[model samples]
Structure formats: structure tokens, C-alpha cells
Target: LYFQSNAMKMTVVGFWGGFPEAGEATSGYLFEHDGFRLLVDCGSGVLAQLQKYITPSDIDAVVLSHYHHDHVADIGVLQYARLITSATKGQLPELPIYGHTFDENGFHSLTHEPHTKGIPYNPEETLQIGPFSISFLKTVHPVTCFAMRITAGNDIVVYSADSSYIPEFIPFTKDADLFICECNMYAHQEAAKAGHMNSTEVASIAKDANVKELLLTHLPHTGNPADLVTEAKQIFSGHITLAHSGYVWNS
Candidate 1:
């Protein structure tokens, strides 16, 4: 069976912040474990980029953090793909989309008849999806957003989604194998007011959380992205990687 393996892997389908760069995508990560594929945050340009790795029909499930365009722009496109694929190649099982119900409209949109179903996830409890167990932490953003700590076997991966620096992050991401954080600003710039974090803020979280590795994502359109990693290295001695399409991590 496909579920026989124990390996867990993550691929960066897209990582640009607000919008996609030319020929690049925004905010998508694909996780595979025990032969089950899960996609987190299908943002703009994600559908096209995701196809480079696997077919849309191959994705077993999806989980979302919030309803922002940059985090969910490709959902409608994904639904359409499922619909068309089912039409041409026979029926595919209904896709389950997990999301919080904080935004009524946003939560309802996740469902699309026989093609997909929206499953409400309780923030208060741990969610079990295939071989992964996920916990949520509400983030400080203009609209409701949640950071996810996903565990597969003994390995943990934390994704900050999009948020300003908050104290809760320290405990939420503690001892994680991979901490995928948002560094939307340079070290010298302020980011809290804009509902984002700077390189310094992200580094502090990685240091305090004592995570093994840090991946900086949700990058700003301006400046060299490598600078964010350079700035983070000053405070976080652990390995740091600047997110880009196709970046892979395995455990």
C-alpha cells in the first residue's frame, strides 16, 4: 500500500508574501507523509507551481490558516481543477479542506458541492489528518490567522502563516525541527503595525524556541531576500534558509 512508508517530507510550492513575483508563486507548502499528501495555504500562483511536483488529483487534503487573498487565492482554482478532472477522468473522492470558522464567509467558501467539503477545525484541540497531527496558535493579525505546528512521528514543523511577533509563538514552536517563519521586513524596519515580522523578530522566535532550523518566508517584494537570512544569522545561530520555490525538507 502507499501508506506503508514512514518518511515525512515538505516541499515549498510557493513562498512570496502578498503577491507572486514574475514566474514565482506565493505562500504554499506541500507535505507528504506515509504516502498521504497534504497542502497548506494555497495562495496566488500556487496551482501552477504545485503541478510541477504532483497532480491536483493527487493531493489528499488541504488546510488553511486564514482567508486573506495571499493565503487563499488559488482555492477557487483548485476547486475548478477538481471539478474538471472528475468530469473528464471519472469521479474523484471529495477533497476535505480544513479551516477555522472565524470568518463565516471564508469558511463557507471552502466547500464546493460534491467536489470538496469544508471541515471546521477547532482551535482548542489537536487535529489528526492522515499521518500528521496539527495544533494551532492564533496569531496577531488584522484578520484572524493561525500558526500551525504539525507533527509527523517525532519530527515537528511549525508554520507561522503571517503575523506580528507575539509571545505565544515561543512556546508554540519550541524544539521544532523546522520553523517556517514570515520575514516581511528587514531588521531595521518595524513590522508589528503592519501585521508582519521583520528578520530580527523572526530570529528571536527561532532563538527563544530553540528550533533546529529556521526557514524565512512570506518575503517582501523589495530588497535582496538573502539579506533577511544574513540579518537573522546574527541572533539565531541555528541553520537558516531563505524560502524559494521547490525547497525541500525531509524527516
Candidate 2:
């Protein structure tokens, strides 16, 4: 038996990889548990899509996996929204944007003083924010990127920010309720040099990790997105979903 009162909801504000298609957005997710809201990865066009679900000022906090433009492009706009809103709506709580200190310059820009604040997160330790406790696992990207394992109550959600094939993921994502993975290549493609994963690589992690459900995100722009799921189905038998703007999942 499941209780709606304790469930956590994850909404895909943007899921496109590299750049957003016309009228779409890239790489942002809204996670809500109880009444606390956390925006994960404010990528290109995220704020516009985010506003469709909740007021930008209502976001409790924001977190990033890395400083790649496609992942952090909207941070600037988000700051502006906060800055402008606070002036007209009176004082709002200072928004805290959590990021790693690996890129000092990128990390430094996350703060906008009276409106927003940049908070550094140590990858080695578990970060407790509101109702969620998140652990990190460094990925195999050209830039320093970390996958997140977020837990609230009994639900576990693991996000594979971006990476190619890596054995470490098998353990990091073990038995998650929802495993949101990046699938930027096709079954016949390889992306080790590009630091992204193909359908097979993503499915292998889901199979080895033994997750309950899998969501393929950070999709390629050229091909048919649904094909990625068909390719993954050959390797993983668990429930699989292709991420899209406005997609919603509850656990």
C-alpha cells in the first residue's frame, strides 16, 4: 500500500541535451517533497518552462551537477527573476544555489547577494537539504560532474547527471526507486570521447544497479527519442521512460 501524503514528486521542466529545441528547454528538474521545492540543474530555457509549474520565487533551493552552459545557462536569468520579484513583492528568502567548488569562477557566479546565495557542497559528504539527503558520485565527464543519489523518507532517486560507461555507477545507483540517466547516443553509437552514454550503456547501469524504474534523459537532438527506449529494453527489463519537458514522476 502507498500513501500519497508521503510521496515525493519529480517534474521534468527541461530534458533536452546540448540545447533546447524550439519551444522546449534543457536539463532542469523540479523535485518536491512535502512543501519544500528543489530545482536541480537550471539549464537553457529552464526558467520559462519552470514558471509553467510554479512561480520562480517559490523555488526553495537550486543545485547543479557541474558548470556546463547547457546545465547552468539559466542561472543568470533565475537570479534576475529573484532580483526583480523581491523589489515588487517585498523581501523574499534569499535563494541558495548549491554547487561544487571545483570551478571556482563558475561557483562564484552563483551568488547574487540580496536575492540569491551560492552554497558550496562537498562531494565527499552527504548534503542534507530540507527533507532530502543527497550523496554524490563523480562522473566520467570531461568536466568535473557528479551524479546524485537523493533520499527522502524511504524513496531513493538517483540521477546520472552525465557520463559514459563506468562501473562505479553499478553500486552508486543500486536499488533506486527511480534512476534518471543520461542517454545521449544511440545503440550503434559510442560517446566515450564525448563523455556521454549510448542506450546500451545506460540500460546496463539500470540492469546492474537493479533500479525499480529508469528514465532516459539528456537526449540527443537528431534521432527519434523513442528509439532510445526500444534499444534499452533489450538490456533492461524494468519499467523505462523517455524524458520530455513537463514529464512527471512520483515515488
Candidate 3:
């Protein structure tokens, strides 16, 4: 309920879905614009959670940012659900799944592992597909990953895909209205070499980018999200919030 008004009604699902608390247990967002549903990164428990409020086939489209198992785990479930209960059940509509090359290819294999029927038929790409002009840039995550920048009207939403410290990341996501960055580890750890960010590192990048708001996600299963919020507040002053499932944002 951060920016509540009839002009726009919104909710955040699973802001930190895999975290310790319930945190709404939502793995993504179900956006309504002109009667269409636009979903972004609805992970494992998310689709089932959506049933509490939405019917699966009613969803207009889904934008998958990457191909990590946790991120794409429930997608097969979604497909099967659609197959079983969609108006276009036997004849499926091609849902546009967008992401970086790795995300696309990775999911391709998952959907088609010889032992199991591959995630077949539907195709995936990372091309821009909305009113908001979006573009992708390569990142340094252990997996082949790319961050995205969305220019919606005059607002910018930059997603810092999972990765370790990269000084050049700031320019890629500069002046964002809402920057959803990954805070996967603490600054004191030696995991920097493993391709992820700590609390301090994530804050420094957001501050340097001069973003308007910084919402951190992909947190490690550790201490507390509040600890990350506190640590970041000390460094990033523009605006910092710990991302929890079911969290909402105007931009």
C-alpha cells in the first residue's frame, strides 16, 4: 500500500518469497493495464499463490527476467495448468517468454530434457515487448545473465540481475525511478568471488547510479532482511526499501 489510490491499484507478491517469513508468499506481480495482465518473474510458489486471487488462464502474459530454477521452476506448472484448463487448452496461444540468451537456452533444456518432455512448443527471447522501451545489457553473474532497463513514460525501472561487483553496472542502470537490485549476500563474506552482491556492495551501486528508489531482492537465506535494510540505509540515502513479497511500487 505504498502508493495507494484509485488511479492505480497494485500489489507485490513474494517480494522475498523464499525468505523466512510468509511475506505474502507472492513470487511476482500481476499488473492490470487496459484489462490486460502483465506478470513479471512469478517464481515457484507464486502461481499457486495467484490462485488465491486469480485464475491461471486469465493472465495476459508473463515476463521472465532470467532462467534460474527458482525463477522458472513453476513455469512448467503454469504451462501444464493452462494445458489442462485454458479456453485455448488443446490449441495453446504462444506466450512470449523474454530473457537473456542464457535464460532462454537454459529453460529450453529444462523444458526438453530427454528423460522428461521438454518445455516445448512455446518460444522465449529477451527482446523488448511493451509500451515501455526496454533493453538488456550483459552482466557478470556465474550464469549467463543480463540486466534490463525499462523506460515507462518518463520513469525508469532497472533490474540488476544476479552478479558480483561490477563498477560499470551503475552506468547501465543510471537514474532509475525504481531500481530492483539483488542483495544475495552480506558484505563481510568471501562470496564476492562467487558472482553475487552483499548489502554494502548493492547499496554502493544503487547510490552511484543515482537511482530514485532501491529495492533489494534475491537475498541469501540468512540473518534478516531488516539487517540488509539497516546496512543499506547507512550508505544509500536517496531511498531504500527491503523488498518483501506482495510489495507494490507506483513506478
lDDT ranking from best candidate downward: 1, 2, 3
Worst 10 residues of 1 by lDDT: 1-10
Write one digit per residue (lDDT tens) for candidate 1, span 1-251: 23333388999999999999999899999999867899999999999999999999999999999999999999998999999999999889999999999999999999998999999999899999998889999999999999999987788999999999999999999999999999999999999999999999999999999999999999899989999999999999999999999999986
Number of the top-ranking candidate, with lDDT as the measure:
1
Task: Report model 3's TM-score to 2 decimal places.
Answer: 0.78
Look at candidate 3 and tell me the lDDT of residue 120: 21
RMSD, every candidate, angstroms: 1.8, 2.1, 5.7
Clashing pairs in 1: none
The true-versus-predicted C-alpha distance at residue 8 of model 1, in Å, is 1.0
Which pairs clash (backbone N, Cα, C closer than 3 Å) in model 2? none
Q: How many residue pairs clash in each candidate?
A: 0, 0, 14
Candidate 1 residue-pair clash tally:
0
User: Which of the predicted structures, 1 or 3, would earn the higher TM-score when compared with the native?
Assistant: 1
Question: Candidate 2's residue-wise lDDT over 28-81, tens digit each?
Answer: 999998888999999999999999999987899999999998899999999999
